[PDB]
Design an enzyme around this catalytic site. Structure first.
Site, short mmCIF file in Angstrom:
data_model
loop_
_atom_site.label_atom_id
_atom_site.label_comp_id
_atom_site.label_asym_id
_atom_site.label_seq_id
_atom_site.Cartn_x
_atom_site.Cartn_y
_atom_site.Cartn_z
N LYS A 1 0.88 -1.20 0.00
CA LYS A 1 0.00 0.00 0.00
C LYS A 1 0.91 1.23 0.00
O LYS A 1 0.64 2.18 -0.75
CB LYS A 1 -0.87 -0.04 1.22
CG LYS A 1 -1.75 1.19 1.37
CD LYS A 1 -2.53 1.13 2.66
CE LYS A 1 -3.38 2.36 2.81
NZ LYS A 1 -4.06 2.43 4.18
N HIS B 1 0.97 4.17 -3.10
CA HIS B 1 0.50 5.52 -2.85
C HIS B 1 1.60 6.58 -2.85
O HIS B 1 1.38 7.73 -2.44
CB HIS B 1 -0.32 5.58 -1.54
CG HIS B 1 -1.60 4.79 -1.60
ND1 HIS B 1 -1.62 3.41 -1.51
CD2 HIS B 1 -2.87 5.17 -1.88
CE1 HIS B 1 -2.85 2.98 -1.72
NE2 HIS B 1 -3.63 4.02 -1.95
N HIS C 1 -3.26 0.51 -9.01
CA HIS C 1 -3.79 -0.64 -8.29
C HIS C 1 -5.31 -0.65 -8.28
O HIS C 1 -5.95 0.36 -8.62
CB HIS C 1 -3.25 -0.67 -6.86
CG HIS C 1 -3.64 0.51 -6.04
ND1 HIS C 1 -3.01 1.73 -6.16
CD2 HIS C 1 -4.62 0.67 -5.13
CE1 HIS C 1 -3.59 2.59 -5.34
NE2 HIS C 1 -4.56 1.98 -4.71
N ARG D 1 -12.72 11.41 7.13
CA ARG D 1 -11.51 10.69 7.46
C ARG D 1 -10.82 11.24 8.73
O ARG D 1 -10.80 12.44 8.94
CB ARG D 1 -10.55 10.78 6.29
CG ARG D 1 -11.09 10.04 5.06
CD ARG D 1 -10.29 10.40 3.80
NE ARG D 1 -8.92 9.85 3.73
CZ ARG D 1 -8.62 8.59 3.43
NH1 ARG D 1 -9.59 7.71 3.19
NH2 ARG D 1 -7.35 8.22 3.30
N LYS E 1 -5.20 9.49 8.95
CA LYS E 1 -5.06 8.95 7.61
C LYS E 1 -3.89 9.63 6.91
O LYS E 1 -3.76 10.85 6.94
CB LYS E 1 -6.37 9.17 6.82
CG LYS E 1 -7.64 8.49 7.44
CD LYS E 1 -7.46 6.97 7.65
CE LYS E 1 -7.18 6.28 6.32
NZ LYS E 1 -7.09 4.77 6.48
N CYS F 1 -13.75 3.77 1.30
CA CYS F 1 -12.93 3.75 0.09
C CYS F 1 -11.67 3.01 0.51
O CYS F 1 -10.96 3.46 1.43
CB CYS F 1 -12.55 5.14 -0.36
SG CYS F 1 -13.86 6.18 -0.86
N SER F 2 -11.41 1.85 -0.10
CA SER F 2 -10.23 1.10 0.25
C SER F 2 -9.82 0.22 -0.90
O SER F 2 -10.02 0.58 -2.04
CB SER F 2 -10.48 0.27 1.53
OG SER F 2 -9.27 -0.37 1.94
N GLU G 1 -2.87 9.03 -5.09
CA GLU G 1 -3.71 7.87 -5.48
C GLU G 1 -3.68 7.61 -6.95
O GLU G 1 -3.61 8.52 -7.74
CB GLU G 1 -5.17 8.13 -5.10
CG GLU G 1 -5.47 7.70 -3.67
CD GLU G 1 -5.47 6.17 -3.52
OE1 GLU G 1 -4.97 5.42 -4.44
OE2 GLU G 1 -5.96 5.69 -2.47
N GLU H 1 -5.83 4.68 -9.13
CA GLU H 1 -6.55 3.40 -9.09
C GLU H 1 -7.63 3.25 -10.12
O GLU H 1 -8.09 4.22 -10.73
CB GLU H 1 -7.30 3.26 -7.75
CG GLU H 1 -6.95 4.21 -6.61
CD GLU H 1 -7.89 4.16 -5.36
OE1 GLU H 1 -9.11 4.46 -5.42
OE2 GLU H 1 -7.38 3.79 -4.28
MG LIG Z 1 -5.44 3.58 -3.33
#
Ligand SMILES: [Mg+2]
EC number: 5.3.3.2
Length: 219
Positions: free
Chosen positions: A28, A32, A43, A62, A66, A78-79, A138, A140
């Site tokens: 992760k 990121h 990803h 959030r 975070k 959101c994950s 991010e 994705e």
């Molecule tokens: Mg992500």
């Protein structure tokens, strides 16, 4: 950085090509980092939009812990799915649905039993890229998932600093306050609210015309 969130940076994400075909796995943290994103690292991820019987959408703010977009208001969850046998499963997007069930419990305290995969509706996919700061960002292809249920909540404060059910008018006032800088929102929430959100919200009972498992919308 927050210790609990730093520990989650070691989770293994699923790397994909631009057509959402799995091509590898990476932590992760590495998925990121802007320096890796600038080179195209991409990803698989998901975003849940959960509505109750009063047709209110469940938002979260959030937590400040975070690492990306701390303190920002966003949709329900959101994950991302992990690179393990259960969540790599591609059949009927079951891996992504399983990951959504898992994170809904981890973040919001929703019992696993209230949100089994059969309760989670995969609508379509959206591809986007954003930067949180100079280091983090991010990139994705996000599976948009919809849930309609009156769940119970017991959120983890490490994950969220607050939650609220909002009507359409209330979301509109929220977005106005974000434009004034009063509050902040995430980029994926901003993109979705500006494009498909109110469209789906008007047809919660007939989402079929809005399901698209073929096209990946490039935002
Ligand atoms: Mg992500």
């Amino acid at each position: 950085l927050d210790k609990q969130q730093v520990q989650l940076l070691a989770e293994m994400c699923i790397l994909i090509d631009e057509n959402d075909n799995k091509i590898g796995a990476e932590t992760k943290k590495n998925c990121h980092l802007n320096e890796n994103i600038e080179k195209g690292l991409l990803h698989r991820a998901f975003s849940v939009f959960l509505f109750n019987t009063e047709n209110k959408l469940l938002l979260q703010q959030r937590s400040d812990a975070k690492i990306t977009f701390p303190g920002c208001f966003t949709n329900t969850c959101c994950s991302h799915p992990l690179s393990n046998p259960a969540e790599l499963e591609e059949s009927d997007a079951l891996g992504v649905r399983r990951a959504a069930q898992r994170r809904l419990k981890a973040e919001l305290g929703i019992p696993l039993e209230e949100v089994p995969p059969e309760e989670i509706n995969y609508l379509t996919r959206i591809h986007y890229k954003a930067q949180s700061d100079g280091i983090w960002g991010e990139h994705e292809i996000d599976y948009i998932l919809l849930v309609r249920k009156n769940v119970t909540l017991n959120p983890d404060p490490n994950e969220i600093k607050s939650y609220c059910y909002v009507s359409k008018e209330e979301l509109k006032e929220l977005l106005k306050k974000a434009a004034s800088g009063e509050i902040k929102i995430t980029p994926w929430f901003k993109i979705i609210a500006a494009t498909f959100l109110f469209k789906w919200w008007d047809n919660l009972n007939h989402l079929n015309q809005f399901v698209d498992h073929e096209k990946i919308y490039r935002m």
